[PDB]
Amino acid sequence: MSEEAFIYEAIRTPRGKQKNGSLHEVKPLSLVVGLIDELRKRHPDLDENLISDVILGCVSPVGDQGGDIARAAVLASGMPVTSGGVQLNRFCASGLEAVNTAAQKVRSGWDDLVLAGGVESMSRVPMGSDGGAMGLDPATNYDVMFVPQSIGADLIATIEGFSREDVDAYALRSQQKAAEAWSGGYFAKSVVPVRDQNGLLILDHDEHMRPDTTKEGLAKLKPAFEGLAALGGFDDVALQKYHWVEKINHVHTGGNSSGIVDGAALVMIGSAAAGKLQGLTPRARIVATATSGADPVIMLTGPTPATRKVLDRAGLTVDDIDLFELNEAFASVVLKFQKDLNIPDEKLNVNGGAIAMGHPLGATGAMILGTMVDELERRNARRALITLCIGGGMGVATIIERV
Amino acid sequence: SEEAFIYEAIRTPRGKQKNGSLHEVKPLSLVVGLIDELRKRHPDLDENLISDVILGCVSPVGDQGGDIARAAVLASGMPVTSGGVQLNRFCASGLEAVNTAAQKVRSGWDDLVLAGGVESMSRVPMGSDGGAMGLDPATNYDVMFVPQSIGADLIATIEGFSREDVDAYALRSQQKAAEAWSGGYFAKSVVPVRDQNGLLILDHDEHMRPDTTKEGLAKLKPAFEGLAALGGFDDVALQKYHWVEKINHVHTGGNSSGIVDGAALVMIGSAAAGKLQGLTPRARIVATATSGADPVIMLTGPTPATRKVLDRAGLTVDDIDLFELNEAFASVVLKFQKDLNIPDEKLNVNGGAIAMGHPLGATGAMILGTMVDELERRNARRALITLCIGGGMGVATIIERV
Amino acid sequence: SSHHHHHHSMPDNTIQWDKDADGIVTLTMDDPSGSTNVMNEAYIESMGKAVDRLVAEKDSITGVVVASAKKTFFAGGDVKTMIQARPEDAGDVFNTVETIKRQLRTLETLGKPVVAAINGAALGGGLEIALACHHRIAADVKGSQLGLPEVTLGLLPGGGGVTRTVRMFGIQNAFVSVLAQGTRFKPAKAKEIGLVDELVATVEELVPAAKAWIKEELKANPDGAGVQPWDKKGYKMPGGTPSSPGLAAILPSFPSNLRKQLKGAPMPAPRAILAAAVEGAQVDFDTASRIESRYFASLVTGQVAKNMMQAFFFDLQAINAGGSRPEGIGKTPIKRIGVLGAGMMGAGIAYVSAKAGYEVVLKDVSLEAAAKGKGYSEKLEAKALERGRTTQERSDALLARITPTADAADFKGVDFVIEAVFENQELKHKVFGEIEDIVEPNAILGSNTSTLPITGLATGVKRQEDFIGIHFFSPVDKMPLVEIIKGEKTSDEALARVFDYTLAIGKTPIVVNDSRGFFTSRVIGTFVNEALAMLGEGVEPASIEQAGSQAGYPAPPLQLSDELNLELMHKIAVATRKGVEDAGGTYQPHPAEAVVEKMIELGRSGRLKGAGFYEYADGKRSGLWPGLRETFKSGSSQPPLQDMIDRMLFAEALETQKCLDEGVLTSTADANIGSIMGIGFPPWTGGSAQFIVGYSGPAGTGKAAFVARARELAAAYGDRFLPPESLLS
Numbered sequence A: 001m002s003e004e005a006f007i008y009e010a011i012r013t014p015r016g017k018q019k020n021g022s023l024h025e026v027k028p029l030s031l032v033v034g035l036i037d038e039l040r041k042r043h044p045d046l047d048e049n050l051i052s053d054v055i056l057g058c059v060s061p062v063g064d065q066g067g068d069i070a071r072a073a074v075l076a077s078g079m080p081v082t083s084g085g086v087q088l089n090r091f092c093a094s095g096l097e098a099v100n101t102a103a104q105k106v107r108s109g110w111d112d113l114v115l116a117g118g119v120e121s122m123s124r125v126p127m128g129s130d131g132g133a134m135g136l137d138p139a140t141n142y143d144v145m146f147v148p149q150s151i152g153a154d155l156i157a158t159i160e161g162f163s164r165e166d167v168d169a170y171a172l173r174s175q176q177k178a179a180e181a182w183s184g185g186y187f188a189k190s191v192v193p194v195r196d197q198n199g200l201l202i203l204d205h206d207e208h209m210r211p212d213t214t215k216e217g218l219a220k221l222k223p224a225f226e227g228l229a230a231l232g233g234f235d236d237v238a239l240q241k242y243h244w245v246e247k248i249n250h251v252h253t254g255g256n257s258s259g260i261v262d263g264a265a266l267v268m269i270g271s272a273a274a275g276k277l278q279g280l281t282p283r284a285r286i287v288a289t290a291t292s293g294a295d296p297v298i299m300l301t302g303p304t305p306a307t308r309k310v311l312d313r314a315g316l317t318v319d320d321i322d323l324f325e326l327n328e329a330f331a332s333v334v335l336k337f338q339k340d341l342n343i344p345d346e347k348l349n350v351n352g353g354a355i356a357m358g359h360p361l362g363a364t365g366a367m368i369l370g371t372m373v374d375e376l377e378r379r380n381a382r383r384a385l386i387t388l389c390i391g392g393g394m395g396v397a398t399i400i401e402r403v
Numbered sequence B: 001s002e003e004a005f006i007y008e009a010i011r012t013p014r015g016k017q018k019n020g021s022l023h024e025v026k027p028l029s030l031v032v033g034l035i036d037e038l039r040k041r042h043p044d045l046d047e048n049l050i051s052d053v054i055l056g057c058v059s060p061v062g063d064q065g066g067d068i069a070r071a072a073v074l075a076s077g078m079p080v081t082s083g084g085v086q087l088n089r090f091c092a093s094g095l096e097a098v099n100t101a102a103q104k105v106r107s108g109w110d111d112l113v114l115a116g117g118v119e120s121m122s123r124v125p126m127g128s129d130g131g132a133m134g135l136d137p138a139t140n141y142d143v144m145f146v147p148q149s150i151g152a153d154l155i156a157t158i159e160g161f162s163r164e165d166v167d168a169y170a171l172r173s174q175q176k177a178a179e180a181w182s183g184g185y186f187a188k189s190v191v192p193v194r195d196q197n198g199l200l201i202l203d204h205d206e207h208m209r210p211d212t213t214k215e216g217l218a219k220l221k222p223a224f225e226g227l228a229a230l231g232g233f234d235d236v237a238l239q240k241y242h243w244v245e246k247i248n249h250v251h252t253g254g255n256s257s258g259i260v261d262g263a264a265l266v267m268i269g270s271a272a273a274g275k276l277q278g279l280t281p282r283a284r285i286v287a288t289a290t291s292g293a294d295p296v297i298m299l300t301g302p303t304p305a306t307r308k309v310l311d312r313a314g315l316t317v318d319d320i321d322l323f324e325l326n327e328a329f330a331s332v333v334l335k336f337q338k339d340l341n342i343p344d345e346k347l348n349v350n351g352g353a354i355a356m357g358h359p360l361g362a363t364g365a366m367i368l369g370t371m372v373d374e375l376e377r378r379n380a381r382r383a384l385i386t387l388c389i390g391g392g393m394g395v396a397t398i399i400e401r402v
Numbered sequence C: 001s002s003h004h005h006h007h008h009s010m011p012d013n014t015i016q017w018d019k020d021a022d023g024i025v026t027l028t029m030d031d032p033s034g035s036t037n038v039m040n041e042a043y044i045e046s047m048g049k050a051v052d053r054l055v056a057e058k059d060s061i062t063g064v065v066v067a068s069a070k071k072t073f074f075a076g077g078d079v080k081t082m083i084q085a086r087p088e089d090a091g092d093v094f095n096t097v098e099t100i101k102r103q104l105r106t107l108e109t110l111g112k113p114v115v116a117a118i119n120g121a122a123l124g125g126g127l128e129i130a131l132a133c134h135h136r137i138a139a140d141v142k143g144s145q146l147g148l149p150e151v152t153l154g155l156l157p158g159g160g161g162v163t164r165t166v167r168m169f170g171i172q173n174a175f176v177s178v179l180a181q182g183t184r185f186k187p188a189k190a191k192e193i194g195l196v197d198e199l200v201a202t203v204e205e206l207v208p209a210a211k212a213w214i215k216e217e218l219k220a221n222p223d224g225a226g227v228q229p230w231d232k233k234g235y236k237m238p239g240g241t242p243s244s245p246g247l248a249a250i251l252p253s254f255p256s257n258l259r260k261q262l263k264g265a266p267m268p269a270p271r272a273i274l275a276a277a278v279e280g281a282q283v284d285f286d287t288a289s290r291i292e293s294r295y296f297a298s299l300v301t302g303q304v305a306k307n308m309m310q311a312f313f314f315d316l317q318a319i320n321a322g323g324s325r326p327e328g329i330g331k332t333p334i335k336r337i338g339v340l341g342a343g344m345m346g347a348g349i350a351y352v353s354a355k356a357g358y359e360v361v362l363k364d365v366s367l368e369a370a371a372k373g374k375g376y377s378e379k380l381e382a383k384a385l386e387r388g389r390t391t392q393e394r395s396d397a398l399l400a401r402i403t404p405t406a407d408a409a410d411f412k413g414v415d416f417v418i419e420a421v422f423e424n425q426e427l428k429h430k431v432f433g434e435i436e437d438i439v440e441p442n443a444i445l446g447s448n449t450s451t452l453p454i455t456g457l458a459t460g461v462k463r464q465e466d467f468i469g470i471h472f473f474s475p476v477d478k479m480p481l482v483e484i485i486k487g488e489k490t491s492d493e494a495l496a497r498v499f500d501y502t503l504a505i506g507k508t509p510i511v512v513n514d515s516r517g518f519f520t521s522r523v524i525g526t527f528v529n530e531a532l533a534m535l536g537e538g539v540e541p542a543s544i545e546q547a548g549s550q551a552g553y554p555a556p557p558l559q560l561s562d563e564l565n566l567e568l569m570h571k572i573a574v575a576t577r578k579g580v581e582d583a584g585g586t587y588q589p590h591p592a593e594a595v596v597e598k599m600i601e602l603g604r605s606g607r608l609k610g611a612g613f614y615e616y617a618d619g620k621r622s623g624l625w626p627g628l629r630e631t632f633k634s635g636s637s638q639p640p641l642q643d644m645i646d647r648m649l650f651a652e653a654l655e656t657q658k659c660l661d662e663g664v665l666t667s668t669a670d671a672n673i674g675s676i677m678g679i680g681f682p683p684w685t686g687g688s689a690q691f692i693v694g695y696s697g698p699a700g701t702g703k704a705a706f707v708a709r710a711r712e713l714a715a716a717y718g719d720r721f722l723p724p725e726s727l728l729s
C-alpha cells in the first residue's frame, strides 16, 4: 500500500465480429503484438528493459491462445527476454484482473513497469474450447448446480421485473451511444487499426455495431436462450434453488446481449518514478481495487458487492463517481446494477457497451478501462468506476482518478 | 506497506506417470482435498475473509480448464466471494501464484489469500494446451523454439558437466529425499489423498527410487537424443550458440525431473488478518523478483532472478541459510550452484524433483512449503526459492522464519 | 493381484469344469445352496479357481463357454450381504468388487474366445459376467430377462456393467438405454439394442452354438479372437470421449437433464452412475473399472441403497409370496367380470381386466356413458398401435372383451363384480341391490371405495361374505397397487380370490383391515393437507410445489389436490368432524380445512370444474392461479425448503405408524410397497415405514434421528408432528 500505480497508456484493437469477421484471419498473438508495436511508436525511446512483466487475460487459453500467450507476445515482438509474461483467467473480468494485478505488483514495490491487458479471438477459439470441471464433470456439475450465464440473466429480469421492452430499451441506448462515440471521434486515439504484415488495413472500426437499430427491430428478435434452457434443463435446475420463482421469463436475445467478437487490449502501468525515468505522462491513477461475489446460479449479480467494497475501500460514495462503466454482458445485468445502487443514467456506460461493440472475454476488462481513461480526459472529469460481472458468481471493480 | 506472512503450506504426495496412484483422481479433487485439510487445522476460520484463490496450472485444458481455482472454491463449498483465478507462467506458476498473493496482500486491497497450484500430468499431458511458440510456424521459426531438454544438455556441454557429474547430483537428490521422508520431515505437510469413501489412495512420493546407485544411473540411455535428431533442435540451438561444435546429451530419466501429479496450497495474509482468525505466522515473504535469460537455452533464468531478489532485499548469498532450486534437470542446478558459489550443504537439502517429481503448475508452491518446514526444523532464518521457466524466464522468492 | 479374496486361510463349489477334445472349456454355474446363481462368497471362490485353471492350462485351451444349470442364467449380487454393509465396511466392499472384476478381466483377456450361453434371466452381476465374454447367445424362451437393474435398488452395476456398456455403446446410449433406469429387456430386445449377439429357439442349442461359434471365430478371425473392441489399438468410443469436441459440447447438459428428470430428489444412484460413466471414459479400462468400484462402495454403504433394497427386494418378495394371503385356499377361476360405472376408474378397471384376458361387462346408467367408458380403452389401444407394442388382431380381441351396456340384465353369468360409482353409501347400496341377484351365486362383490368403511357397505347386500374392498388408483392402466380391504363379515375365501385376481391383472396386492380412510387415502390426505396448511400460513405456492418435487413425489401437492377435487376433501373433513362430535368430543380441524373451504367459496374446487390452485385451459394445466398470492398473502412466510420437505414426508410417516398401531396394516412390507405403489411415496425412502427406521438428515440416522427431527418439527409447526409412544423409549 505504498507506491501509487499510474496508467500511462491504454489502447485496444477494434472488435471484429464472429460471423464473417475481419479479424478471423488474424492470429490472437498478432493482435497483441500489434498493440505492442503501437506502444513503441508512441514512445520510441522507452527502455523496454524496465518492463518487468506482461500480464494478459485469456478465458480460453488453448490452441492459438495456449502456452502462455503473454510470454509468446514478449518473444514474438522482440521485447527483452527479462520482460516475463503470464496468462491469467478469471472468466469475464480477466482483462481488468490483469490490470488490477499489475497495479498491485507496482504498489508492492517489487515491480516498476508492467504491461497488462487481454486477448480473445472468439471466432478462432470459441468459448468453452478449454473444457472445465464445473461443466464437463458430472459429480461437480451436479453439486455446483451449473447454469449458463444466459439463464441467470433471464432469471434476473424475472425477479427484478425487467420486461422484454425494458432490456431492448437499454440495447437501443447502447447502440446509440456507441455510434455517437465513434461519430464524435471519441475513439480516434485508443482504437488501433489492425494491419497485416505489409501494412495493409484489416479492420479499423467496431464492426459488430448496428447504429440503425430500432425498437421495432429488436422486438422482432427471438429469445436466443430458449432452446438451450429447455433442451438442457437448465431452467429447472435454476428454479430448484430459486424455488419461489414459478417461471423464468426469457427476455434476452442476440440484440440485447453482448456480441461474440475478436479483440485485444493493452495497458501500461507503472510507478511515478518509472514514468519520470522513461519520460511518460501519467493519464490516471488506480485508486482502489476489489473482488467479491454472489450466488453462482444467478451468476451475474457479482458487480454489486464488488462495487460497494471498492467504494468503501477508497473512502468514496456513489455521488463521488463521475462515470460508471459496467460490462454489458446482458441488458438485465446493467439494469439490476443501476437499480441496486441508484446509478444516474447519464453516468452509466456513456459511450455504449458490449451489446453494440462486443465482448471479447479476456480483453473486455482492459478495453472498458481504457474507454474510461479517455472519457475522463475528454470530459475533464475526475473519477470513474469500472466493474464486470463474472461467471461462477464473481465480481471485480476498479476506481481510477484522472491525473 | 503491509507485510505478507505464510500461515499454512501443504501439498499432496506426488503420484507417478506410469501406473500412478493419482491417475484416477481428478485435478479438482486434489485441490479440494487440500482445502478440507486447511479446514481441519482451522475449523473456526471465517472463510468469508478469504478474498481470492490463486492457482498455477501450466496446461489449463480438459479437467484443468475453465478456471480450476474457481471450480475449487465452488466445489469445496467456500464462500462465493472467495474469487478464484488461474494463471500460467510455465514451471514457476506455483511460486508466481504465491508471489502474486503476497503482492496483493502488500497492496492492502487483499487480506487473506489462498495460493498454490495443481498439475495432473498423467491425465493432462504437457503441451495439451497447444500454443503459438510451438504450433505456429511463423513465431516458432522466429523465437527459435527448442525443448527444455536440449537446453539442459547444452548447459552441461558449455559448463563442462559430464555424465558422471549430472548422475552424481541425481544420486544425491534421491539420497536426501529418502532421508527427509524416513526422518519424518514431511509428516505434517504431505496430506494423504483419499477417495470419496475415506480409503487411502496415496500417502508418499511414489516416484522416488531410494535404492538408486551410481552404476544404475550409468546404465540409462540419453532420453533426449531422439528428440534432437528427429526435430532438428540440436542444429537450431547451435545456430545461436555457434561456438560449440556438438551438444553432449547427458540427461536421462534418472537425472531429470519426474513427470508426476500433485497439488499444493499456501495460505497468505497480513498480520491483522492472521490475528483476527487466530492464525500463527510461520514465515514472512521478504521479497520477490522476476527476470529472464536467453529462450533457446531456456533454463538460465534462475541466476538473474536470484540476483535481483537478493539486491531488492539488500542481502547476499552469505545471508541465506537454505537454497531451494527446482531440479528440472541436473545441469540446471549445477550451473546455478557454480554461478553463485552456493555451498553444497545449503542447496536442495531435502531432495528435489529428480527424486520426487515436478508437477508443473504446483511445483513452485511445493518447494516453497518445503523450505517453510525446513527453516522451522533447523531453526534457521532465511531461505531463497527459485525455479527455471520455459521461454527463458526466472522467478525467485526470499522467505524469513517467524 | 490374486483371483481370490484372501491371501490367507471353506465355501461350496458352484462351477463345473469340462474340457472337451477340441480344447473348449465349459464353465457351468450351479450353486448347490440355492435355486439361482448369485455373486456370494461361494461364487467368488469358485470362479477364482476356474480362472486360475484357465491360465494354468492355457496351452491346451482353445475357447471357453460360460453356461448355467439353473432355470435362470445368473441372478446377480447377494442382496442379503449388501444390505448389511456399513460405512466402515467400505474397504471390504471395494476389495470384493475389485476381486470380482479381476476374475472377469482375466477371462476377458485370455487370448481366446469366450461365449456366454444365456439360458434364462441374466440380471445385474449375471449380465456383467456375460458382458465380460466376447460373444453372447441367448435362448428365446419365456420369462427370460436381461438388464442391469442395480439402480432400482439404489446401487450401480459394480461388476463392470458401467465400464463395459459405456465401452460398447458410449456414454449417452449406455446411460439412457441401459444404466440410468435399469431396464429389463427380453432376449429379442436385447439383441436389438446390442446386449446380445445371437438368438436360439431352445436352451439345448446354446452350448452347441457356442462351440460352433468358437470354431468359426478361430478360423475366420484368428487375430481378433478373444479381443474385445476396446482392447484393440484403434478403438474409438461411440459418440466420442469427453475430450472430443462433439460430446464435449453437450456433456454439460447431462447432469442438468438428470437433475431435471429427478426434480432434485435425493436419490444418489443415478448421479453416481453418470459420474462413473463419464470419469471412466476419460481413462484406460482398468482405471475406469477401479473408479466404478469406488462409486459402488459409496452407494452400498449409504442409507438410500438400504431403503431401496429393503422395499424393492425384500418387501416386494414377501408380498409376491403370499405374505398377506390367507392360508390354504384353493384357486377359483374367473369367467366374466362386471364393472359398475364407466368413469375414469371403472373404464380403467375394464381396460386392465380385458388386457389380462377377461370378459368384461361395462354397465352405466346410460348406453352413451358406457360407450365413452369403452372409448378409454380404445384411446389406449390406438396409442399402443402407434408406438408398436401390440398388433391389430390382438388389440381387436382386447376391445372385443369389453361389452358396454346400460341394462342390469347383461350381468348374467358375471362371477366377479367391481363397483366404481360415486362415493355414497346408499348409492352403492342401491347399485349393488339391482345386481346381487342377477350375477352368479358365488360371485365376488368388490367395491372401489376411497374412504367409506367396507363393513357398512356390506349391509346393503345379502351375502356379506363375498363383499370386499378392491381399491384401484387413477390412472388404473399405470398404477400397480390394489388395496384389498377386509370387512368384519368378509371371509378369507374372498380374500384369496381378489388376491389372485390382483396378480392375474399384473398388479401388487396389500391387505388392509377395515377403517375409515383405509391406508392409502388416509395417509395421502395428511400429505395434501400439510401443503394446504403451508399455503394458508403464507408460503409461496411455487415453493410448496418445489418442496413436493424435491422431496421425491411424482406430482406436487397442489397439483394433486386439484386432481383429487377439493369437494371430496371437504366431504372427508365433514365425516371426520361428525364422528368426533357424535361421541361428545371437540373436533380439532386441520389447518388445511380453512384453505379447502376458502377455495370452494371462491369457486375453485379443482380440475373437474376447470379452476383450482392452477389455471386450466383447453384441458391442459396452464399455471398457478395469479389470485392465489393475494388470497393467502404468499411470501409472508419463508421457512427453509428442507422444513417444507420434511413436513410432508413426516406427516405421512407418522400417519403410517398410527395405521400400524391401530391394526389397519399388518406388516411394514405392505406399508412400504403400499405407500410407494399406491400414493407415490418417494422411492428413495423405501416407503413411509422404512422412512422412520432409515431417516437421514444433518442430525444423524435411524429411528432416534427420526424422532429428534419430528420433535423439532413439532416445536415449530404443530403437535401433529409429535411421535407416537410406539417409536419412543
Ligand SMILES: CC(C)(COP(=O)(O)OP(=O)(O)OC[C@H]1O[C@@H](n2cnc3c(N)ncnc32)[C@H](O)[C@@H]1OP(=O)(O)O)[C@@H](O)C(=O)NCCC(=O)NCCS
Pocket: A092, A149, A210, A213, A214, A217, A218, A221, A224, A253, A254, A255, A256, A257, A258, A259, A260, A329, A359
Ligand atoms: C445471444 C447470442 C446467442 C446470439 O447468437 P446469434 O443468434 O448467432 O447472433 P446474431 O448476431 O446472428 O443474432 C441473431 C439474429 O438477430 C439479428 N440481430 C442482432 N442484433 C440485432 C439488432 N440490433 N438489430 C436487428 N437485428 C439484430 C441478427 O442479424 C440475426 O438475424 P438472423 O439470424 O435472422 O440473420 C450470442 O450473441 C451470445 O451467446 N451472446 C451472449 C453472451 C455470451 O454468450 N457470453 C458472455 C458471457 S458474460
Ligand SMILES: CC(C)(COP(=O)(O)OP(=O)(O)OC[C@H]1O[C@@H](n2cnc3c(N)ncnc32)[C@H](O)[C@@H]1OP(=O)(O)O)[C@@H](O)C(=O)NCCC(=O)NCCS
Pocket: B018, B091, B148, B149, B209, B212, B213, B216, B217, B220, B223, B252, B253, B254, B255, B256, B257, B258, B259, B328, B358
Ligand atoms: C526424461 C524423461 C523423458 C524420461 O521418461 P521415461 O523414459 O518415461 O522415464 P522412466 O523413468 O519411465 O524410464 C527411464 C528408464 O530408466 C530407469 N530409471 C529411471 N530413473 C532411474 C533411477 N533413479 N535408477 C535406476 N533406473 C532408473 C527406468 O526404470 C527406465 O528403465 P526402462 O526404460 O528399462 O523401463 C521424462 O521423465 C521427462 O521428459 N522429464 C523431464 C520433464 C520435462 O521434459 N520438462 C520439465 C519442465 S522444466
Ligand SMILES: CC(C)(COP(=O)(O)OP(=O)(O)OC[C@H]1O[C@@H](n2cnc3c(N)ncnc32)[C@H](O)[C@@H]1OP(=O)(O)O)[C@@H](O)C(=O)NCCC(=O)NCCS
Pocket: C034, C035, C036, C038, C072, C075, C076, C077, C078, C079, C080, C121, C123, C124, C125, C126, C149, C150, C153, C317
Ligand atoms: C432372478 C429373478 C429375476 C427371478 O427369480 P424367481 O425365479 O422368481 O425366484 P424368487 O424370486 O422366488 O427367488 C428364489 C431365491 O433366489 C434368491 N435370490 C434371487 N436373486 C437374488 C439376489 N440377487 N441376491 C440374493 N438372493 C437372491 C431369493 O432370495 C430366493 O431365495 P429363497 O428362495 O431361499 O428365499 C428375481 O429373483 C429377481 O428379480 N432377482 C433380483 C436381481 C437383481 O435385481 N439384482 C440386483 C443386484 S446385482
Ligand SMILES: CC(C)(COP(=O)(O)OP(=O)(O)OC[C@H]1O[C@@H](n2cnc3c(N)ncnc32)[C@H](O)[C@@H]1OP(=O)(O)O)[C@@H](O)C(=O)NCCC(=O)NCCS
Pocket: C151, C152, C153, C154, C180, C181, C182, C258, C261, C262, C270, C308, C312, C477, C478, C479, C480, C554, C676, C677, C678, C680, C683
Ligand atoms: C424408483 C424405482 C426403483 C422404481 O419405482 P417404481 O416402483 O416403479 O415406482 P411406483 O410405485 O410409482 O411405480 C408405478 C409406476 O409404474 C408405471 N408404469 C407401469 N407400466 C408402465 C408403462 N407401460 N409405461 C409407463 N409407466 C408404466 C406408472 O406410470 C407409475 O409411475 P412411473 O411411470 O413414474 O414409473 C426406479 O424407477 C428407479 O430407481 N429409477 C432410476 C432413477 C431414474 O428415474 N432415472 C431416470 C433419469 S432419466
Ligand SMILES: Nc1ncnc2c1ncn2[C@@H]1O[C@H](COP(=O)(O)OP(=O)(O)O)[C@@H](OP(=O)(O)O)[C@H]1O
Pocket: A244, C540, C543, C635, C638
Ligand atoms: N427463500 C425465499 N422464499 C421466498 N422468497 C424469497 C426467498 N429468498 C428471497 N426471496 C425474495 O427475494 C427478494 C429479495 O431477495 P433477497 O435479497 O431476500 O434474497 P437472499 O435471501 O438470497 O438475500 C424478496 O422479494 P421482494 O422483491 O418481493 O421483496 C424476497 O421475498
